[PDB]
Design a protein around this ligand. Structure first.
Ligand SMILES: C/C(=C\COP(=O)(O)OP(=O)(O)O)CO
Ligand SMILES: C/C(=C\COP(=O)(O)OP(=O)(O)O)CO
Lengths: 190, 190
């Protein structure tokens, strides 16, 4: 059973992350749920303080915990949301000015545009071919081997693995949404 | 550098397998080189014994040693070949009658058809998008987690990961070539 083997694999090798959204980091156009599990976009930017930790250009928010070591996974209910990008980024990313979200710029993210265009946000972007659109996505980090990978968390099918790299400093769970859609992104608890 | 990270990741996690081909398993249309590292195809079936372990239908050959446990990798020079498939199969796969080469039938393989069509031999087959056609492919096995994955061995880019599974019995390196063409399939030594 592919669900069973996915469950047994993630349990054997990856620490289960309990990820909550940090509204202090969130671009002003983002709405973070009271339980800090769910992410929607506002109509327009809210008036929030431009504290140094807040994303002011990218429509990004971070988790409340970073990783400097170990294997970690978390799963995100993306449901039928037609646009979303998730993964990890370095503590030291540019949060204020425009930069391309690329591994070179400290972002390892994949996701969906316009309902049907899956991409890895590599440089240049990798067009994914996804036979079964995921409803829940597992994010898998191995700090020591520089590994960031993504799976369909319902059927265990692989989506994308970045080239193995070298990480500098802490890695944060990162979430980006560009559009207004009925379906929020929701983090599954550990 | 992605090559260096690829080298450090296989060193951290995977035991380098020294794979040689077992000519007694090779379909009678295949030629195994005397050093048992290279594979070619004949114009017709040659006259060989139909010993039980020989693939009579599928243009396959196994390695000389199996895996019942652990993390293992080997790399295969596919060069400019227009057709090839490689991966692992269970000891108990059908050798004589036709079976579809699928995980359900005990086969975990990916490869190339008609020079440009990269596929995983899932059921259904998964169409791959590969930006840089590999000359050398890394095959990565984790027996315990039921993981088979494939990399471009030269630049470290990921090709394909099968859904995690549960293996039954020993796994063998398997190699398949269907075409009569100038470039051999060559295994890289450990
Ligand atoms: C406006 C915006 C993001 C769009 O960035 P880009 O337009 O660079 O596109 P992508 O390839 O999706 O990163 C806010 O995060
Ligand atoms: C004739 C032959 C193999 C072709 O099998 P199939 O025609 O099932 O094709 P594939 O999807 O490539 O496995 C001998 O191994």
């Amino acid at each position: 059973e592919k669900s069973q083997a996915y469950a047994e694999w993630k349990k054997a090798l990856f620490q289960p992350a309990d990820v909550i959204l940090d509204p202090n980091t969130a671009n002003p156009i983002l709405l973070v749920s009271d339980d800090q599990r769910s992410l929607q976009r506002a109509d327009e930017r809210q008036n929030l303080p431009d504290n140094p930790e807040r994303f002011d250009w990218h429509y990004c928010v971070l988790g409340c915990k970073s990783f400097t070591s170990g294997r970690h996974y978390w799963e995100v209910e993306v449901g039928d949301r037609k646009e979303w990008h998730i993964g990890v980024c370095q503590e030291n990313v540019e949060r204020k000015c425009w930069v391309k979200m690329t591994p070179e710029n400290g972002f390892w993210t994949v996701g969906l545009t316009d309902g049907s265009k899956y991409r890895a946000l590599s440089d240049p972007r990798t067009k994914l071919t996804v036979a079964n659109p995921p409803q829940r996505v597992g994010v898998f980090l191995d700090y020591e081997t520089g590994e960031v990978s993504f799976y369909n968390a319902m059927d265990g099918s692989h989506i994308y693995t970045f080239p193995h790299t070298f990480f500098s400093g802490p890695l944060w769970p990162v979430f980006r949404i560009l559009t207004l859609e009925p379906t929020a992104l929701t983090i599954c608890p550990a």
